[PDB]
Amino acid sequence: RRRIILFPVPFQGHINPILQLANVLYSKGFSITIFHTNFNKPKTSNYPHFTFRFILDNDPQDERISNLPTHGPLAGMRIPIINEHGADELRRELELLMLASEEDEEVSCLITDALWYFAQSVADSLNLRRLVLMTSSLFNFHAHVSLPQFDELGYLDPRLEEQASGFPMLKVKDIKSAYSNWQILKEILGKMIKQTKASSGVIWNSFKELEESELETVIREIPAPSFLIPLPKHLTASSSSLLDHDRTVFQWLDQQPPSSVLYVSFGSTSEVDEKDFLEIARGLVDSKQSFLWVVRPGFVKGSTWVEPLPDGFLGERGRIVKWVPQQEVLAHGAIGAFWTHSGWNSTLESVCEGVPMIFSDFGLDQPLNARYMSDVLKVGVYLENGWERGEIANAIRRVMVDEEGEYIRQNARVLKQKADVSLMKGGSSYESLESLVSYISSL
Numbered sequence: 294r295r296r297i298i299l300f301p302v303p304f305q306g307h308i309n310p311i312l313q314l315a316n317v318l319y320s321k322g323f324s325i326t327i328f329h330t331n332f333n334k335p336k337t338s339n340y341p342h343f344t345f346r347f348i349l350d351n352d353p354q355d356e357r358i359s360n361l362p363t364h365g366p367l368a369g370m371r372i373p374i375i376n377e378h379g380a381d382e383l384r385r386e387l388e389l390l391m392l393a394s395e396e397d398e399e400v401s402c403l404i405t406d407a408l409w410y411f412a413q414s415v416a417d418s419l420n421l422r423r424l425v426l427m428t429s430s431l432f433n434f435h436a437h438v439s440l441p442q443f444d445e446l447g448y449l450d451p452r453l454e455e456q457a458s459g460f461p462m463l464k465v466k467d468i469k470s471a472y473s474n475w476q477i478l479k480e481i482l483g484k485m486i487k488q489t490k491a492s493s494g495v496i497w498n499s500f501k502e503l504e505e506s507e508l509e510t511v512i513r514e515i516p517a518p519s520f521l522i523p524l525p526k527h528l529t530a531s532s533s534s535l536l537d538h539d540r541t542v543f544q545w546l547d548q549q550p551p552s553s554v555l556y557v558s559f560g561s562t563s564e565v566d567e568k569d570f571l572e573i574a575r576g577l578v579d580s581k582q583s584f585l586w587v588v589r590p591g592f593v594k595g596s597t598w599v600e601p602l603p604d605g606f607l608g609e610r611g612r613i614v615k616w617v618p619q620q621e622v623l624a625h626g627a628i629g630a631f632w633t634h635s636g637w638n639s640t641l642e643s644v645c646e647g648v649p650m651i652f653s654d655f656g657l658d659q660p661l662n663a664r665y666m667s668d669v670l671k672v673g674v675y676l677e678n679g680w681e682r683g684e685i686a687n688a689i690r691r692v693m694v695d696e697e698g699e700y701i702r703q704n705a706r707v708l709k710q711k712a713d714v715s716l717m718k719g720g721s722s723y724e725s726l727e728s729l730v731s732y733i734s735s736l
């Protein structure tokens with residue numbers, strides 16, 4: 294019998310894939326321990342088959358992380374702080390668990406978010422193999438490792454619409470948006486890459502037929518074995534939701550004709566102007582399509598939730614809610630399209646449910662995902678120039694209704710079919726999971 298310890302980053306887009314992976318590995322016969330902060334902890338009662346151990350921010354909470362806001366952009370300061378200072382405690386917790394191990398039980402490996410680069414030297418010091426879960430795409434990584442060529446060209450130092458000389462698949466404007474914050478994030482990024490290369494294995498939330506152009510880069514740049522597993526095709530992340538679901542949406546979805554509803558969501562941490570929020574809204578009302586919008590409290594700047602919106606503005610065709618089981622909504626027959634911020638989990642969920650997309654972005658990997666999806670795979674339309682009520686209306690209608698958008702809708706159906714085929718025997722994802730289990734078992 295073999296145990297795997299998994300250590301996620303405590304944010305929705307990072308907890309979701311790591312607990313999907315944990316469930317996949319449990320289904321293959323491993324026992325599971327989750328090391329987690331108290332901050333943003335998921336509902337442990339949803340996981341009776343996992344053992345949770347809460348670490349790093351137990352009371353008395355430390356002076357370096359105590360006082361930190363639980364919401365907003367500053368909540369992410371916990372990540373560099375834990376990387377810088379958490380090694381001693383992580384080692385103690387791993388050793389305690391390895392000690393209490395049953396006689397017939399061995400800890401096979403530690404799997405961490407790639408962002409926990411500090412865990413490599415900790416695992417090394419215990420003779421414990423560490424594997425890394427990437428929560429972003431292979432294409433994004435390929436763009437990472439190409440930054441030197443980008444740096445020389447001054448792309449990183451603020452000709453927007455031409456293709457990048459290194460990357461034909463990207464525009465210069467994409468690269469400028471993705472790496473707008475290079476002084477600040479550059480340090481974390483380099484160490485994350487270095488310790489991912491130095492790990493014992495890299496698990497990617499993707500599949501070969503989604504990112505075939507990128508496989509050779511990962512083989513060449515990362516000496517450790519890579520595994521591609523499309524986690525949403527195995528199970529949804531419903532059980533790791535950090536917020537209560539509004540399931541009243543499914544009764545409303547059941548009142549809509551097939552493929553008639555635009556699902557709209559900009560993720561778990563994006564935020565917008567009071568100006569932009571009302572323009573998007575008019576863009577939705579203008580498209581004349583039915584829509585289900587998820588607006589996270591605080592998504593709006595200056596408002597607690599949605600106060601700028603006049604009572605009844607959405608009228609007959611629109612509903613706004615705070616939070617849903619997103620992949621389950623995307624699977625509903627009423628959904629015709631997904632207007633997304635292009636976060637990687639959302640993008641992959643939509644791909645796995647065969648839903649074509651309209652793309653916005655808020656930087657980081659998001660513009661790269663939108664570019665790849667829209668121009669390589671051609672499963673959506675990219676709103677790559679801000680929020681205009683007009684342009685929004687046309688993109689929505691092009692994907693949902695226009696005969697001219699039929700190829701985008703068909704591409705999304707075919708790509709979902711490829712995801713499904715990949716989990717079949719002899720499929721790429723099946724073989725990658727088979728390889729991952731036997732590899733972990735050999736450790």
Ligand SMILES: O=c1ccn([C@@H]2O[C@H](COP(=O)(O)OP(=O)(O)O)[C@@H](O)[C@H]2O)c(=O)[nH]1
Nearest residue numbers: 306560561562587616617619636637638639
């Ligand atoms: O109403 C919502 C909105 C989002 N999500 C989930 O939140 C995660 C968001 O991750 P993503 O990588 O798309 O973007 P982020 O929020 O990290 O920017 C995904 O798994 C979504 O399915 C959800 O369950 N309900």
